[PDB]
Amino acid sequence: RFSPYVFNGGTILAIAGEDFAIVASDTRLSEGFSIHTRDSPKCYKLTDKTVIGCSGFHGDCLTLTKIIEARLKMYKHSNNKAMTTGAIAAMLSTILYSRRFFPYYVYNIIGGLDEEGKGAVYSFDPVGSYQRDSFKAGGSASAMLQPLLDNQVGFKNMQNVEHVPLSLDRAMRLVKDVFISAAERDVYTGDALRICIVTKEGIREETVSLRKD
Amino acid sequence: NQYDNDVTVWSPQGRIHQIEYAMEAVKQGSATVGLKSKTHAVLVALKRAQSELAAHQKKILHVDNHIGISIAGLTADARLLCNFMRQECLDSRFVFDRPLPVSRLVSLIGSKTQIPTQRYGRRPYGVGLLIAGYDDMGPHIFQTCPSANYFDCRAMSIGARSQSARTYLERHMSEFMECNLNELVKHGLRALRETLPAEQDLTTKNVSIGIVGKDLEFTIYDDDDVSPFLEGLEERPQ
Amino acid sequence: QIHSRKMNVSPDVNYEELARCTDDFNGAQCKAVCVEAGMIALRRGATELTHEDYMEGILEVQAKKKANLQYYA
Amino acid sequence: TGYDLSASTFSPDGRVFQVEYAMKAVENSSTAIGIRCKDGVVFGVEKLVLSKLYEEGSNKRLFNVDRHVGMAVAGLLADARSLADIAREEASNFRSNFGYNIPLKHLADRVAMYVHAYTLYSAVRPFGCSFMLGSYSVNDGAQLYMIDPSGVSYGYWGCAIGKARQAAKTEIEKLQMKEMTCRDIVKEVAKIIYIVHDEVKDKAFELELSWVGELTNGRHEIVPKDIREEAEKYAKESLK
Amino acid sequence: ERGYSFSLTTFSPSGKLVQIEYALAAVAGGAPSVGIKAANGVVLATEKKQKSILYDERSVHKVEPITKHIGLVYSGMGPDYRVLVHRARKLAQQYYLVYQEPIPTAQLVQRVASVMQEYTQSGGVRPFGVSLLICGWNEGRPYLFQSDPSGAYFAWKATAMGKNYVNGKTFLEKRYNEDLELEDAIHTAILTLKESFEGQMTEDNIEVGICNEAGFRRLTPTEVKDYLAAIA
Amino acid sequence: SYDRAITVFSPDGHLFQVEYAQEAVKKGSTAVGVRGRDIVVLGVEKKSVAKLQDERTVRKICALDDNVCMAFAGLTADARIVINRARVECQSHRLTVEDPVTVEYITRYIASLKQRYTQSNGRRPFGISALIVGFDFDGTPRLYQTDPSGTYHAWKANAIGRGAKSVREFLEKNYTDEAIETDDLTIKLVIKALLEVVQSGGKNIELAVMRRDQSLKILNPEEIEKYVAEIEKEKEENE
Amino acid sequence: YDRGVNTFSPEGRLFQVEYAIEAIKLGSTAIGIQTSEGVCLAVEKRITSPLMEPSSIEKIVEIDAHIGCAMSGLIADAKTLIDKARVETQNHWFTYNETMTVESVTQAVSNLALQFGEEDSRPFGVALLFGGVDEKGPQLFHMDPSGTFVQCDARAIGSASEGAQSSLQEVYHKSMTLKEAIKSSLIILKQVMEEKLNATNIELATVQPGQNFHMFTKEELEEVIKDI
Amino acid sequence: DRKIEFSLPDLEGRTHIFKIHARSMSVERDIRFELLARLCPNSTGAEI
């Protein structure tokens, strides 16, 4: 009979930096065997210091996005200040749990700064549990993406591996290489790569073309 | 007498003294003046306190990016209508994904407040809401009343001793549709300096000014950033 | 304007302002504004009449009960 | 005393003073006139300018209920626009349930019942409003209904409410509404309020005119500016 | 809307229910009627005068059946009667749907009296202004019961309500015994309506119904003219 | 739904129904309670009956748990429903947190009920006042009282009822530390108290004790005459 | 003779709210002082009987480890507002994983403060002082029975309130310290209370930026008494 | 024309009334009246 869920693809990625955070995603909205559009970014500037990514069911991504955008203004009108990143994660965990018996089909990763100018990544299940991590990939090709960042970022399984902190440019060429490497194998990887960068100054955006199978 | 007890009871002249007494608290609150240019709407408030150690009570409240209000009455009913006001902004912003037309909002406020003015055992709301906002038709300055009869205008004043401010506005209202902010605001300061005792005027902690701007979000200026606006004024003639 | 004839009045007055800020009066109360403004100037010992004298005479003709009400707005 | 408090108690001679007190507040509202011509209805509202600080086009005492049905009011503004809200919703009930536009004989019946509903109980008061309804149909001609505070409606070739009600309706019967199309009706409707609300009682007024007919293609709208400028050209023919 | 939700009937400082006291006077200002049981069934008789000749006496009725074997009359005001008439008409059906048996008259009087006392205490209502007479031959034996606006009830051999009932109870005291018949109670019922009736007593100034073991029914003006015939 | 405000403010700031209900307390029978260091004891006065019928039904002292005893004054009917709801609540504590109820907790329940009960719609306030006595866990004996406004309030000893201020004057005029030396001496203090306020010291007394680990115990009318007898003996040799 | 509960004055305000403003004059007086070092706070007890246990009554009650409260006037109604404050702060921590600010607590109670009517019954006879250390350092707020709240710096509420304010404006300044503020308060309390001051007539509680809420007891209290 | 109100004294009028009705009686010298005017919020000069 009538099914209420469908899968829209998409794959997001966040990396916490030392004084920055990088959130990126492709821009393909599509389902079945066909393409709806080649332009659908998953970057969402919540504040100047908080960017969320939303993959999964697209209508739930839109609805959840707008509900968050309401509750920020409810907080600010309640308290004469802006939310912090952990406050946003602590709220949205309750929001996701609030429909426990009819869940959103949504994966979510929040990137952004702390109160001290440090990167913070919060990855969500589709129910409402979370933790703070250094780097998480979410979406279809997250299984393609995670161990490469475990090797390069996490320095795992390497002998005599020194530990330089990740520079911003090394992170940029890391992202730009790894989405090409995912694009060569996943069918859901899009054609353009919206990259959003949160610094102490503000939000930078950048779009890099991909292949278009 | 006996015609002066309930909202339902009509006078033999047909003038309900409960509404006529609801018009008193707006005369009991402190004065404030709103106005608008071709492209900007400015309202200026006058704070009060009780002791000199006690802080001054604020009146200008932020509603939306393009909507700000001022109050005169009791703060409880002010917040009671204010939460409804925020709600009626954000729900239609949630539905239509657009800002909200100010006159259409105020019609909903009048329909909101007309209802307890007709039932039994139901007070009216004692508040004096001046409303500044933007449609696509630029600035709009509205005033309310506890009788739920909202008035469009170009400049008004409500609060205790507001008639003198009205007399100032009538003999300078022709100038207002050309001058921009830096002299428009101090025109409003020339309104609020009238309604005072003859020794104290503008001591940088009793005043606040809110502005919505043609490409500018509604911004409240308080006890600091007022000092650039507050300087450059004449002394009170005596 | 009629009962303000036989008093020393400085040209500060605005009868449009006074009559507009005074509704619900009669000729007796409007005359009573003229006499009470005619007295407060003698309380301060002034010789002519100013606008705020009429403004206080409005308050006395209204004759409100004072009870500690400053906590509004 | 004590017989004139509730809307549930009769008088010892058998009436209700609450409804009459609510009727008395209508004669403090200014003036609302409206006549129906040979092929349309023209409403006429004069509007007192209270202070100069108001903006032209504020607080309009003339409404727009349906695409074709219009309303002009005289009473208390909040209750008047409340009745405009429930009637405006009521036409949406008619078209939503039945699929065509509401006739006036049904619509004024529904609104009149809703007004009469607040004439019984100690919980609510009577309305302090009265108003006029009129529209045009190509299958039914033009209509003109007026509703008191008590909830009684009638058809009219012309009607008038406000302060100078008799001093309005005395001069309406001089006209010939049975044959005049709604063109010179604008000038005559203008003049019959031009001859009232003198500069003694009024500081200044404002003309506000509504207009409907098949010349308006059935839809209801306001008059154009130039036509009421011809009416204001027809203003100063009262000095002779 | 909603009601008032407070009783407008309080105890006096003398300890009296003043609205019930006034309602009894309103019953006492009612039309006279009387009812008699005698050894085979119950006879009810009332006094119905049209105010002029323009009315139709064949339209409305005072004697009303409640079921196959229970009739009911009153002595009081008009529009209060028909409401609790219709209520009792319902109550016999809610008995009969449960038990599949016609209601005992006493069990009817329980529920009607509970309706009246239930009605005299609740918020925002005046109490009723009638008193009833209820007849029926359940299980052979006839029965005659009388209610009141306060909600009490009694078991009368024969009594009278309306005006001059203090004279009528003396007359029935001097007249009735245990051993009579239905037509005998008819004849003395006409004889006691003639104690306080108007100048003329036609075939339609009254209305008479009877119970038997055959059940309750109502008379027509033919045999009412036959009973008023050869009477007095 | 009878929606009506009853408890309204006076023009000078009073609650008339509350202060009338305290008068209805002030006409109630006199009850006195003290606490000992190891055994608490309390008793009502003025049994006042016909002395020829039954009486267990008129006993104005109840228990709420094993460790909580309770007496009262005022009108009788409103008291026992508060007793019932208090029993349901103190059972529900054990359905929650496993320990027995502390007397401070249950008195906050009672006063908290009574205050919002004055705050509600269409309700006269309660016309009772109670003394609640409990030796808690870890054996710290204490007591409280309950105003009809609902202000729980600790004491070392107290007395409510008709003619209670003079009794309180006797208690402050007589209470020492060595008055609570022996348990029967404390009972002699209470019987000394009621006796000089309840006049005729016959069978009007109804005393009941608790030894901080037992249940309540009511003495039969033999130690009433025995303790009153030795009380009049000690006053007799004292005179 | 009997109006409604929701009737406006001819002067314009109300009747019952202003009567509640009259009602709070009978309570025991309380003084709190906002100081950049930290907020101190004090109240008397109005001890009646020697048989009465002193520590069972209180006016200091905390809401969180950084928010304390002080009450006046009627007492039994205040515990409802204390409960709503506690529940409200635990909701805010439960949903945002942070501390609700003191002003937002104060408007959260003050919105509740005026809600009586004739549907779904009277205003409250209390007067509250809120001592708090938020992220903006020390705070001090005072609300009304009418739900009107404001920030003060040294507010005195009770029977001797207008005398203590008059004796308090003369001694407060912007650069106070805590140790002088406590003794400065107790001088005023010693002036205005009835009975002889001891370690049991009064009680105090402070709150600091460093440490949490703390209430004084009869060991650390009498040093200010002997050092008055 | 004149509509003079007579209300209750605030605090200082009460203390002044204590000084009026209390000046002419043998008292303890070191009492204070301000405590009593604290104890009389709503009271008349007759009651004082």
Side-chain angles (χ1 to χ4, degrees), chain F residues 89 105-119 146 149-152, chain G residues 76-77 80:
Chain F
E89 178 67 30
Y105 177 75
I106 194 66
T107 50
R108 282 192 291 112
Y109 180 73
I110 294 169
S112 70
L113 186 145
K114 192 179 265 80
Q115 190 275 127
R116 63 177 294 276
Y117 182 78
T118 62
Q119 187 55 250
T146 299
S149 65
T151 64
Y152 63 97
Chain G
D77 50 353
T80 302

PDB file of all heavy atoms in Angstrom, chain F residues 89 105-119 146 149-152, chain G residues 76-77 79-80, unseen atoms left out:
ATOM      1  N   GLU F  89      -1.672   9.336  50.278  1.00  0.00           N
ATOM      2  CA  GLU F  89      -0.395   9.939  49.927  1.00  0.00           C
ATOM      3  C   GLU F  89       0.760   9.259  50.644  1.00  0.00           C
ATOM      4  O   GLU F  89       1.788   8.951  50.029  1.00  0.00           O
ATOM      5  CB  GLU F  89      -0.416  11.425  50.252  1.00  0.00           C
ATOM      6  CG  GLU F  89       0.888  12.128  49.957  1.00  0.00           C
ATOM      7  CD  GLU F  89       1.204  12.192  48.478  1.00  0.00           C
ATOM      8  OE1 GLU F  89       0.261  12.228  47.660  1.00  0.00           O
ATOM      9  OE2 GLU F  89       2.403  12.199  48.132  1.00  0.00           O
ATOM     10  N   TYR F 105       7.507  15.862  55.652  1.00  0.00           N
ATOM     11  CA  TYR F 105       7.013  15.652  54.297  1.00  0.00           C
ATOM     12  C   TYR F 105       5.498  15.561  54.261  1.00  0.00           C
ATOM     13  O   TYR F 105       4.858  16.192  53.408  1.00  0.00           O
ATOM     14  CB  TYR F 105       7.636  14.389  53.712  1.00  0.00           C
ATOM     15  CG  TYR F 105       7.153  14.024  52.341  1.00  0.00           C
ATOM     16  CD1 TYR F 105       7.592  14.726  51.224  1.00  0.00           C
ATOM     17  CD2 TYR F 105       6.275  12.973  52.154  1.00  0.00           C
ATOM     18  CE1 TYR F 105       7.157  14.383  49.965  1.00  0.00           C
ATOM     19  CE2 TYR F 105       5.835  12.626  50.900  1.00  0.00           C
ATOM     20  CZ  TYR F 105       6.282  13.336  49.810  1.00  0.00           C
ATOM     21  OH  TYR F 105       5.847  13.004  48.548  1.00  0.00           O
ATOM     22  N   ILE F 106       4.904  14.810  55.189  1.00  0.00           N
ATOM     23  CA  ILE F 106       3.456  14.645  55.122  1.00  0.00           C
ATOM     24  C   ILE F 106       2.739  15.924  55.552  1.00  0.00           C
ATOM     25  O   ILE F 106       1.662  16.242  55.031  1.00  0.00           O
ATOM     26  CB  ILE F 106       3.014  13.405  55.927  1.00  0.00           C
ATOM     27  CG1 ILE F 106       1.575  13.031  55.586  1.00  0.00           C
ATOM     28  CG2 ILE F 106       3.178  13.588  57.420  1.00  0.00           C
ATOM     29  CD1 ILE F 106       1.405  12.569  54.169  1.00  0.00           C
ATOM     30  N   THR F 107       3.347  16.717  56.437  1.00  0.00           N
ATOM     31  CA  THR F 107       2.738  17.993  56.784  1.00  0.00           C
ATOM     32  C   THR F 107       2.866  19.004  55.659  1.00  0.00           C
ATOM     33  O   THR F 107       1.969  19.837  55.478  1.00  0.00           O
ATOM     34  CB  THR F 107       3.345  18.546  58.066  1.00  0.00           C
ATOM     35  OG1 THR F 107       4.771  18.517  57.966  1.00  0.00           O
ATOM     36  CG2 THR F 107       2.871  17.752  59.270  1.00  0.00           C
ATOM     37  N   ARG F 108       3.961  18.954  54.891  1.00  0.00           N
ATOM     38  CA  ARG F 108       4.003  19.764  53.679  1.00  0.00           C
ATOM     39  C   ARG F 108       2.973  19.307  52.665  1.00  0.00           C
ATOM     40  O   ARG F 108       2.468  20.130  51.892  1.00  0.00           O
ATOM     41  CB  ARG F 108       5.379  19.737  53.029  1.00  0.00           C
ATOM     42  CG  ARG F 108       6.401  20.613  53.687  1.00  0.00           C
ATOM     43  CD  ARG F 108       7.624  20.728  52.808  1.00  0.00           C
ATOM     44  NE  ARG F 108       8.360  19.474  52.737  1.00  0.00           N
ATOM     45  CZ  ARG F 108       8.452  18.728  51.642  1.00  0.00           C
ATOM     46  NH1 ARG F 108       7.839  19.111  50.531  1.00  0.00           N
ATOM     47  NH2 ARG F 108       9.138  17.594  51.663  1.00  0.00           N
ATOM     48  N   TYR F 109       2.662  18.011  52.642  1.00  0.00           N
ATOM     49  CA  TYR F 109       1.587  17.553  51.773  1.00  0.00           C
ATOM     50  C   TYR F 109       0.247  18.124  52.208  1.00  0.00           C
ATOM     51  O   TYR F 109      -0.546  18.560  51.367  1.00  0.00           O
ATOM     52  CB  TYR F 109       1.519  16.034  51.743  1.00  0.00           C
ATOM     53  CG  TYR F 109       0.409  15.563  50.847  1.00  0.00           C
ATOM     54  CD1 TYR F 109       0.533  15.650  49.472  1.00  0.00           C
ATOM     55  CD2 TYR F 109      -0.773  15.058  51.371  1.00  0.00           C
ATOM     56  CE1 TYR F 109      -0.480  15.234  48.642  1.00  0.00           C
ATOM     57  CE2 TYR F 109      -1.796  14.654  50.551  1.00  0.00           C
ATOM     58  CZ  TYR F 109      -1.640  14.733  49.187  1.00  0.00           C
ATOM     59  OH  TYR F 109      -2.658  14.317  48.366  1.00  0.00           O
ATOM     60  N   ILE F 110      -0.016  18.129  53.513  1.00  0.00           N
ATOM     61  CA  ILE F 110      -1.322  18.556  54.001  1.00  0.00           C
ATOM     62  C   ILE F 110      -1.498  20.057  53.826  1.00  0.00           C
ATOM     63  O   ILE F 110      -2.514  20.519  53.290  1.00  0.00           O
ATOM     64  CB  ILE F 110      -1.501  18.134  55.466  1.00  0.00           C
ATOM     65  CG1 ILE F 110      -1.547  16.617  55.565  1.00  0.00           C
ATOM     66  CG2 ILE F 110      -2.763  18.724  56.042  1.00  0.00           C
ATOM     67  CD1 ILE F 110      -1.466  16.115  56.971  1.00  0.00           C
ATOM     68  N   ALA F 111      -0.507  20.835  54.264  1.00  0.00           N
ATOM     69  CA  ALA F 111      -0.589  22.285  54.131  1.00  0.00           C
ATOM     70  C   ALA F 111      -0.559  22.707  52.671  1.00  0.00           C
ATOM     71  O   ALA F 111      -1.243  23.662  52.279  1.00  0.00           O
ATOM     72  CB  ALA F 111       0.552  22.943  54.901  1.00  0.00           C
ATOM     73  N   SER F 112       0.209  21.984  51.851  1.00  0.00           N
ATOM     74  CA  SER F 112       0.251  22.269  50.424  1.00  0.00           C
ATOM     75  C   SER F 112      -1.084  21.981  49.761  1.00  0.00           C
ATOM     76  O   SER F 112      -1.477  22.695  48.836  1.00  0.00           O
ATOM     77  CB  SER F 112       1.339  21.443  49.753  1.00  0.00           C
ATOM     78  OG  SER F 112       0.973  20.077  49.742  1.00  0.00           O
ATOM     79  N   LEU F 113      -1.781  20.942  50.216  1.00  0.00           N
ATOM     80  CA  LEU F 113      -3.132  20.694  49.736  1.00  0.00           C
ATOM     81  C   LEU F 113      -4.079  21.794  50.174  1.00  0.00           C
ATOM     82  O   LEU F 113      -4.926  22.235  49.389  1.00  0.00           O
ATOM     83  CB  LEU F 113      -3.619  19.336  50.240  1.00  0.00           C
ATOM     84  CG  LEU F 113      -4.956  18.759  49.770  1.00  0.00           C
ATOM     85  CD1 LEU F 113      -4.814  17.259  49.650  1.00  0.00           C
ATOM     86  CD2 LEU F 113      -6.095  19.070  50.733  1.00  0.00           C
ATOM     87  N   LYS F 114      -3.943  22.244  51.414  1.00  0.00           N
ATOM     88  CA  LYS F 114      -4.905  23.177  51.975  1.00  0.00           C
ATOM     89  C   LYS F 114      -4.781  24.556  51.345  1.00  0.00           C
ATOM     90  O   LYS F 114      -5.791  25.241  51.148  1.00  0.00           O
ATOM     91  CB  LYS F 114      -4.706  23.248  53.481  1.00  0.00           C
ATOM     92  CG  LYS F 114      -5.801  23.951  54.221  1.00  0.00           C
ATOM     93  CD  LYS F 114      -5.508  23.942  55.703  1.00  0.00           C
ATOM     94  CE  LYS F 114      -6.190  22.784  56.412  1.00  0.00           C
ATOM     95  NZ  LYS F 114      -5.459  21.501  56.243  1.00  0.00           N
ATOM     96  N   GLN F 115      -3.558  24.963  50.997  1.00  0.00           N
ATOM     97  CA  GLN F 115      -3.354  26.294  50.434  1.00  0.00           C
ATOM     98  C   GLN F 115      -3.953  26.398  49.039  1.00  0.00           C
ATOM     99  O   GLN F 115      -4.716  27.327  48.752  1.00  0.00           O
ATOM    100  CB  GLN F 115      -1.863  26.630  50.414  1.00  0.00           C
ATOM    101  CG  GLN F 115      -1.528  28.081  50.072  1.00  0.00           C
ATOM    102  CD  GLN F 115      -1.462  28.360  48.584  1.00  0.00           C
ATOM    103  OE1 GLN F 115      -2.115  29.273  48.083  1.00  0.00           O
ATOM    104  NE2 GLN F 115      -0.684  27.560  47.869  1.00  0.00           N
ATOM    105  N   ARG F 116      -3.598  25.465  48.152  1.00  0.00           N
ATOM    106  CA  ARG F 116      -4.190  25.455  46.818  1.00  0.00           C
ATOM    107  C   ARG F 116      -5.676  25.158  46.878  1.00  0.00           C
ATOM    108  O   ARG F 116      -6.436  25.563  45.991  1.00  0.00           O
ATOM    109  CB  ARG F 116      -3.483  24.435  45.928  1.00  0.00           C
ATOM    110  CG  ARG F 116      -3.611  23.005  46.397  1.00  0.00           C
ATOM    111  CD  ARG F 116      -2.949  22.057  45.435  1.00  0.00           C
ATOM    112  NE  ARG F 116      -3.651  22.051  44.159  1.00  0.00           N
ATOM    113  CZ  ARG F 116      -4.724  21.311  43.901  1.00  0.00           C
ATOM    114  NH1 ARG F 116      -5.221  20.507  44.830  1.00  0.00           N
ATOM    115  NH2 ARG F 116      -5.299  21.372  42.709  1.00  0.00           N
ATOM    116  N   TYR F 117      -6.106  24.475  47.931  1.00  0.00           N
ATOM    117  CA  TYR F 117      -7.517  24.314  48.190  1.00  0.00           C
ATOM    118  C   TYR F 117      -8.191  25.638  48.531  1.00  0.00           C
ATOM    119  O   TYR F 117      -9.376  25.806  48.233  1.00  0.00           O
ATOM    120  CB  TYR F 117      -7.680  23.304  49.306  1.00  0.00           C
ATOM    121  CG  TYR F 117      -9.092  23.021  49.643  1.00  0.00           C
ATOM    122  CD1 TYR F 117      -9.862  22.189  48.845  1.00  0.00           C
ATOM    123  CD2 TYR F 117      -9.665  23.596  50.760  1.00  0.00           C
ATOM    124  CE1 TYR F 117     -11.161  21.931  49.166  1.00  0.00           C
ATOM    125  CE2 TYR F 117     -10.945  23.343  51.091  1.00  0.00           C
ATOM    126  CZ  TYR F 117     -11.696  22.520  50.292  1.00  0.00           C
ATOM    127  OH  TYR F 117     -12.990  22.295  50.647  1.00  0.00           O
ATOM    128  N   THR F 118      -7.474  26.579  49.141  1.00  0.00           N
ATOM    129  CA  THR F 118      -8.014  27.929  49.245  1.00  0.00           C
ATOM    130  C   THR F 118      -7.891  28.704  47.948  1.00  0.00           C
ATOM    131  O   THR F 118      -8.690  29.613  47.705  1.00  0.00           O
ATOM    132  CB  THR F 118      -7.303  28.725  50.330  1.00  0.00           C
ATOM    133  OG1 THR F 118      -5.919  28.853  49.987  1.00  0.00           O
ATOM    134  CG2 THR F 118      -7.424  28.034  51.655  1.00  0.00           C
ATOM    135  N   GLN F 119      -6.906  28.373  47.123  1.00  0.00           N
ATOM    136  CA  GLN F 119      -6.651  29.069  45.873  1.00  0.00           C
ATOM    137  C   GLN F 119      -7.628  28.674  44.774  1.00  0.00           C
ATOM    138  O   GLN F 119      -7.800  29.431  43.814  1.00  0.00           O
ATOM    139  CB  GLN F 119      -5.201  28.790  45.445  1.00  0.00           C
ATOM    140  CG  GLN F 119      -4.657  29.552  44.254  1.00  0.00           C
ATOM    141  CD  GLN F 119      -4.792  31.040  44.423  1.00  0.00           C
ATOM    142  OE1 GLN F 119      -5.594  31.674  43.743  1.00  0.00           O
ATOM    143  NE2 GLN F 119      -4.033  31.606  45.353  1.00  0.00           N
ATOM    144  N   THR F 146      -1.038  22.845  61.952  1.00  0.00           N
ATOM    145  CA  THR F 146      -1.544  23.176  60.625  1.00  0.00           C
ATOM    146  C   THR F 146      -2.577  24.282  60.756  1.00  0.00           C
ATOM    147  O   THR F 146      -3.667  24.057  61.287  1.00  0.00           O
ATOM    148  CB  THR F 146      -2.150  21.952  59.948  1.00  0.00           C
ATOM    149  OG1 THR F 146      -1.144  20.947  59.799  1.00  0.00           O
ATOM    150  CG2 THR F 146      -2.701  22.323  58.585  1.00  0.00           C
ATOM    151  N   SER F 149      -4.902  28.411  56.894  1.00  0.00           N
ATOM    152  CA  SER F 149      -4.238  28.941  55.713  1.00  0.00           C
ATOM    153  C   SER F 149      -3.236  27.954  55.140  1.00  0.00           C
ATOM    154  O   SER F 149      -2.893  28.052  53.959  1.00  0.00           O
ATOM    155  CB  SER F 149      -3.527  30.249  56.036  1.00  0.00           C
ATOM    156  OG  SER F 149      -2.472  30.018  56.953  1.00  0.00           O
ATOM    157  N   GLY F 150      -2.758  27.017  55.948  1.00  0.00           N
ATOM    158  CA  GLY F 150      -1.833  26.013  55.471  1.00  0.00           C
ATOM    159  C   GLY F 150      -0.386  26.369  55.720  1.00  0.00           C
ATOM    160  O   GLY F 150       0.438  26.303  54.807  1.00  0.00           O
ATOM    161  N   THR F 151      -0.057  26.744  56.950  1.00  0.00           N
ATOM    162  CA  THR F 151       1.315  27.065  57.329  1.00  0.00           C
ATOM    163  C   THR F 151       1.779  26.024  58.339  1.00  0.00           C
ATOM    164  O   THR F 151       1.441  26.108  59.524  1.00  0.00           O
ATOM    165  CB  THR F 151       1.408  28.470  57.903  1.00  0.00           C
ATOM    166  OG1 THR F 151       0.643  28.535  59.110  1.00  0.00           O
ATOM    167  CG2 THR F 151       0.856  29.479  56.917  1.00  0.00           C
ATOM    168  N   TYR F 152       2.539  25.040  57.869  1.00  0.00           N
ATOM    169  CA  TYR F 152       3.095  24.035  58.764  1.00  0.00           C
ATOM    170  C   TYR F 152       4.173  24.665  59.629  1.00  0.00           C
ATOM    171  O   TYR F 152       4.912  25.546  59.185  1.00  0.00           O
ATOM    172  CB  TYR F 152       3.652  22.855  57.969  1.00  0.00           C
ATOM    173  CG  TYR F 152       4.803  23.188  57.052  1.00  0.00           C
ATOM    174  CD1 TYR F 152       6.118  22.975  57.446  1.00  0.00           C
ATOM    175  CD2 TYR F 152       4.574  23.668  55.771  1.00  0.00           C
ATOM    176  CE1 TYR F 152       7.168  23.263  56.605  1.00  0.00           C
ATOM    177  CE2 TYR F 152       5.615  23.964  54.925  1.00  0.00           C
ATOM    178  CZ  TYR F 152       6.909  23.757  55.345  1.00  0.00           C
ATOM    179  OH  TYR F 152       7.950  24.045  54.499  1.00  0.00           O
TER     180      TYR F 152
ATOM    181  N   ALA G  76       2.451  30.601  52.503  1.00  0.00           N
ATOM    182  CA  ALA G  76       1.995  29.293  52.049  1.00  0.00           C
ATOM    183  C   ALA G  76       1.726  29.267  50.553  1.00  0.00           C
ATOM    184  O   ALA G  76       1.810  28.206  49.925  1.00  0.00           O
ATOM    185  CB  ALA G  76       0.743  28.888  52.820  1.00  0.00           C
ATOM    186  N   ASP G  77       1.423  30.415  49.966  1.00  0.00           N
ATOM    187  CA  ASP G  77       1.273  30.520  48.525  1.00  0.00           C
ATOM    188  C   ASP G  77       2.595  30.523  47.779  1.00  0.00           C
ATOM    189  O   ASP G  77       2.615  30.204  46.586  1.00  0.00           O
ATOM    190  CB  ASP G  77       0.492  31.786  48.201  1.00  0.00           C
ATOM    191  CG  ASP G  77       1.051  32.994  48.910  1.00  0.00           C
ATOM    192  OD1 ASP G  77       1.962  32.823  49.751  1.00  0.00           O
ATOM    193  OD2 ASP G  77       0.585  34.117  48.629  1.00  0.00           O
ATOM    194  N   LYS G  79       5.241  28.653  47.984  1.00  0.00           N
ATOM    195  CA  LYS G  79       5.852  27.364  47.678  1.00  0.00           C
ATOM    196  C   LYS G  79       5.445  26.857  46.303  1.00  0.00           C
ATOM    197  O   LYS G  79       6.202  26.112  45.666  1.00  0.00           O
ATOM    198  CB  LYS G  79       5.479  26.345  48.751  1.00  0.00           C
ATOM    199  N   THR G  80       4.263  27.257  45.834  1.00  0.00           N
ATOM    200  CA  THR G  80       3.858  26.976  44.464  1.00  0.00           C
ATOM    201  C   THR G  80       4.803  27.634  43.470  1.00  0.00           C
ATOM    202  O   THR G  80       5.285  26.987  42.532  1.00  0.00           O
ATOM    203  CB  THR G  80       2.429  27.464  44.247  1.00  0.00           C
ATOM    204  OG1 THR G  80       1.563  26.814  45.182  1.00  0.00           O
ATOM    205  CG2 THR G  80       1.970  27.152  42.839  1.00  0.00           C
TER     206      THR G  80
END
